[PDB]
Design a protein around this ligand. Sequence first.
Ligand code: QA8
Ligand code: MN
Lengths: 429, 18
Amino acid sequence: KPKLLNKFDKTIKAELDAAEKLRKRGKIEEAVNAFKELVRKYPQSPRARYGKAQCEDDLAEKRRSNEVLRGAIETYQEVASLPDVPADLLKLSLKRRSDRQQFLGHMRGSLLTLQRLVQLFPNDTSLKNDLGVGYLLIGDNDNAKKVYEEVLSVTPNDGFAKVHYGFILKAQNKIAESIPYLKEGIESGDPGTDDGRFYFHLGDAMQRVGNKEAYKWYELGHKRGHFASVWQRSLYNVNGLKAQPWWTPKETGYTELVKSLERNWKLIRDEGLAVMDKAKGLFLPEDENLREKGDWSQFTLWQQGRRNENACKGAPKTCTLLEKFPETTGCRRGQIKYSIMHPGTHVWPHTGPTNCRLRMHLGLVIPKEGCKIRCANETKTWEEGKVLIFDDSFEHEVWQDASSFRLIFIVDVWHPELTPQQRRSLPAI
Amino acid sequence: GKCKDGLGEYTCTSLEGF
Ligand SMILES: CC[C@H](CC(=O)O)C(=O)C(=O)O
Ligand SMILES: [Mn+2]
C-alpha cells in the first residue's frame, strides 16, 4: 500500500529490494552494509537512507543498546532532509523518529519532530493527536489542551482526542466537565482509548461528584486488565506481589524499622514540631488535587530514594536514624515525610501510583477524636508512638474533624517480596 | 510534576530506553 519509492528509486528497486530482503531475513549486519553501500552510491535516495535507518533500528533492538538507536534517530532525520521524498515515506520516517525519541525519553526532541509532522501534514488528525501526547509528556497541559480542542472541532467524534481532553480537564479539576469526554472516548473503542489512565480518572471523577456508576468503570477496567482489582487501582506495578490493604509489622518483615520508629517516636515528633514552629515553609501544601476541603501539608525528607539535604537540616536526628534502613531510604517509589492535617479536612478517596511500596504511618500528634483513615474496607485510627502499615495502591480516604492539628510520619518501604535486582532497576516514581 | 500520593500526571516515570 504505502508508496515509498520516488522516481529515481524505482530505477534502483532491484538493489533496494535485495538490501531490504537481507534486513527482513534478520541478516542485520549484511543489510546495514548493503544499505550503506546504496547510500554512498545513491546519496540522494530516500529509500536507501530509510533502509539504513531501519537497519540501525533493528540493530539497537537486537543489541538492546540505546547508542545504536540514537544513530538510527539521526538517520530517520536524514531521510526527511533528502529531496523528492514521497509523502508516505516522509511520514513513516519522522513518526518512527518521534516514537524512538520517546522510547529513549527524549521528550523535547520528540515534541519537535511532532510539530514538524503536523506542519508537513496539516490534515492528518492522528498526527495532531500524537502532537498532543508530545505536549503531555513534557508537562505542557495548556498546549495539549489546545491541540485536542482543534482535533475535536474538526473531528468531534475522535475518541482518542476525547479521552485525552477529558484527562486534561480532570487534571484541571474540571471534574463534571471531564466525565462525558472520558466516558464517550472509552466507549468509542478507538485505538488508544483502552487505557488504564482513563478508567482510573473517569471512576475517580464519578466518585467525586457522587455518581454511583464509578465502580462499574472500575470493574470494567479490572475486566480489561488495567487494575489488579476493583479496589487496588495502581498503574505502575509488578504483578504477583501480595496484595492486601493492611499489613502487620511481621507481615512486612521490616520489624527493626518499626521498632526504631516506635521506640524513638518522641524525637521524630519533636523535630517535626520544631520545623512547624521555626521553619514552617518547609511544609508544602499537598498539590495533587486530593482534597475535597481543608489544610494538608507535608515536609519531605526523602523522595525517589534521594535525601533532601536541606530538609534534613531541620530533622537531623530523624534523618540519621533513618539512614540505617535502606528499605525506606532507597525506596525509589516512595517517600519519607512528615504530614500535618488540620480540622475540616477530607481527603478524596484515591489510590497511589504503584503496588511496589507499602506505607508506614507513625503517630506523632494525634487528637483524641476526629481523625481516621479508611483503606479499602477497613477504617483505623492513629496512636501516638505507634505504626500503622497499609498498601496505598488500594483506595484510601482520610478525615480530620478534630479541634487541633494531626501530625504523622510517613515512611514508605519497598514491597517486601521485591527482589534486590527489582529494587535496583524499577524506574523511580 | 511527580506522582507522589496519586496518579494525576499523564505519566509517572521518566523512561530511558532499554
Ligand atoms: C489521605 C492522606 C494520607 C496521608 C495523611 O493522612 O497525612 C494518604 O493519602 C497517604 O498516606 O498516602
Ligand atoms: Mn494517599
